[PDB]
Structure 1
Amino acid sequence: MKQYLELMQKVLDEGTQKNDRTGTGTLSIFGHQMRFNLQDGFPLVTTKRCHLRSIIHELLWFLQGDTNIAYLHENNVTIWDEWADENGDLGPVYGKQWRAWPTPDGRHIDQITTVLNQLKNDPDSRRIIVSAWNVGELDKMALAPCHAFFQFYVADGKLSCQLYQRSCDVFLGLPFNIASYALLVHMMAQQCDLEVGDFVWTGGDTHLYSNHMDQTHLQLSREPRPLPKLIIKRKPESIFDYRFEDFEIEGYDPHPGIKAPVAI
């Protein structure tokens, strides 16, 4: 997509040389922002083939509050396998915070229901927010949340959402993350009888791994194709009752997939 390639070119042109915790080199900038008007089309990158399969399953899994990889195994989704312990536990990651943020006084807070209520009953609110950044639980997570925090906003019948992403692998992670939140905006909007507005992506440490330079140059040689259209085949009774088969993408004509490796 224009915005995504622009970010990619920006990091090449402006990135400073920066290592990760493994010591793998990156080119890195700090602070970036992109906007996707969801009425223009579903923002799934076209300059390489991306599959929605794992994105949908992972979102549904988040929404269930499940932190065990079992449901992903049931569907042969393996993207969380590298972080899971021997019983398949990830500690209190995304799903547990979204659906059951624990408080000092023994409660478990369902931030998804909170936000849905707020969107229906108080759409002007400036605090419609879900955070996964539970400071006291970071140590137990297999991973500190990358998409840390998000806010919704309603104006003129349209639902928007902004994500803060503390750390972004622009090549491997970003296309996935964008489509993931865009999906959630479409499900949220449907459940509240709103149309879709903007997904605004904000990044902290926004980087390209040095071993992704050939792929980056290749993708930058390609022209964005028209955006696909998301189809929701069915309207469920709640945000928690979406099924995998509810979602279709039409008009997805991507250039070919490109593989990118990780160091260990």
Structure 2
Amino acid sequence: MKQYLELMQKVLDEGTQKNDRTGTGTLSIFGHQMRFNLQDGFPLVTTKRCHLRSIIHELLWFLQGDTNIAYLHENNVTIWDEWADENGDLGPVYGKQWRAWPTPDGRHIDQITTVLNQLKNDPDSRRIIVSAWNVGELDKMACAPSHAFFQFYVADGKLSCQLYQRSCDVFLGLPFNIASYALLVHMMAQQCDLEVGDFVWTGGDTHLYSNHMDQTHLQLSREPRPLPKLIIKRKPESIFDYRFEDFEIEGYDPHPGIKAPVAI
């Protein structure tokens, strides 16, 4: 997409050479923001085909609050396979913190139920937030949350959401992360009876891996296509009742997918 393709070119032109924990290099910048008006269309990258299948399964898995990858296994989603332990456990990563953030005194906080009630009873709140950044549980996680904190906002009947992404693999993770959050906004807008507003994406350490450079150069030579349109075929009773088949993307016409080596 245009903002996506400008950010890629910005990392190339001004990123500085950095080394990651894996000994692979990166070109990196710090501080970047893009805004997607979801009424202009579903923000799925069109300069390389992006499969939504796993994105959709992951989001539902998150909202259900389980962190073991058996559900992903049941639908053959393998994006989390390498962090899981022998029992398929990730520790208390995203979904555990979204639905059951553990308190000092033994209880759990359901941040999705909270934001849904704030959106419905107090939509002008300035603290309609969900944080995955549970400092006291970072050491138990298979990985520290990348897409770390998000906030919702309502204006003129429209629901917007901003994500702070402390660490961003521009080529491989970003298209995935942008779709995931746009998806959730549509879902929440429907459950709160709102229209969709903007998806504001803000990055911390925003980088392109050194072995993503040919694929980036190839992707910058293509021209973006008009954005697709998301169709939710059925309005379920609550935000926790979506099923994979509820979502359809229409008008998606991407250039060919581009394969990139994944860095562990």
1:42-61 residue CA offsets vs partner (Å, 9 max, x unmatched): 00000000010000000000
Return the TM-score normalized by structure 2. 0.99
CA–CA separation in structure 1 for the residues paired with 2:177 and 2:189: 18
1:7-33 residue CA offsets vs partner (Å, 9 max, x unmatched): 000000010001111111000000000
The structural deviation recorded for 1:225 is 0.3
1:210-238 residue CA offsets vs partner (Å, 9 max, x unmatched): 11111101100001000000000000000
DSSP 3-state at the match of 1:207: strand
CA–CA separation in structure 2 for the residues paired with 1:25 and 1:34: 25
The structural deviation recorded for 1:262 is 2.4
Identity %: 99
DSSP 3-state at the match of 2:44: coil
- Coordinate RMSD, CA, aligned: 0.5
DSSP 3-state at the match of 1:29: strand
The structural deviation recorded for 1:2 is 0.3
DSSP 3-state at the match of 1:4: helix
Give the total of aligned pairs: 264
Alignment partner, residue 100 of structure 1: 100
Alignment partner, residue 242 of structure 2: 242
The structural deviation recorded for 1:125 is 0.3
The structural deviation recorded for 1:131 is 0.2
Q: Is 1:255 aligned to 2:250, yes or no?
A: no
Q: 1:263 to 1:107 in 2, by over 3 A?
A: closer
Return the TM-score normalized by structure 1. 0.99
Give the gaps of 5 or more residues in structure 1: none
CA–CA separation in structure 2 for the residues paired with 1:8 and 1:17: 15
Alignment partner, residue 23 of structure 1: 23
Give the gaps of 5 or more residues in structure 2: none
1:88-123 residue CA offsets vs partner (Å, 9 max, x unmatched): 000000000000000001110000000000000000
CA–CA separation in structure 1 for the residues paired with 2:210 and 2:105: 46
The structural deviation recorded for 1:263 is 3.9
CA–CA separation in structure 2 for the residues paired with 1:218 and 1:22: 25
1:43-81 residue CA offsets vs partner (Å, 9 max, x unmatched): 000000001000000000000001000000000000000
DSSP 3-state at the match of 1:198: strand
CA–CA separation in structure 2 for the residues paired with 1:204 and 1:139: 21
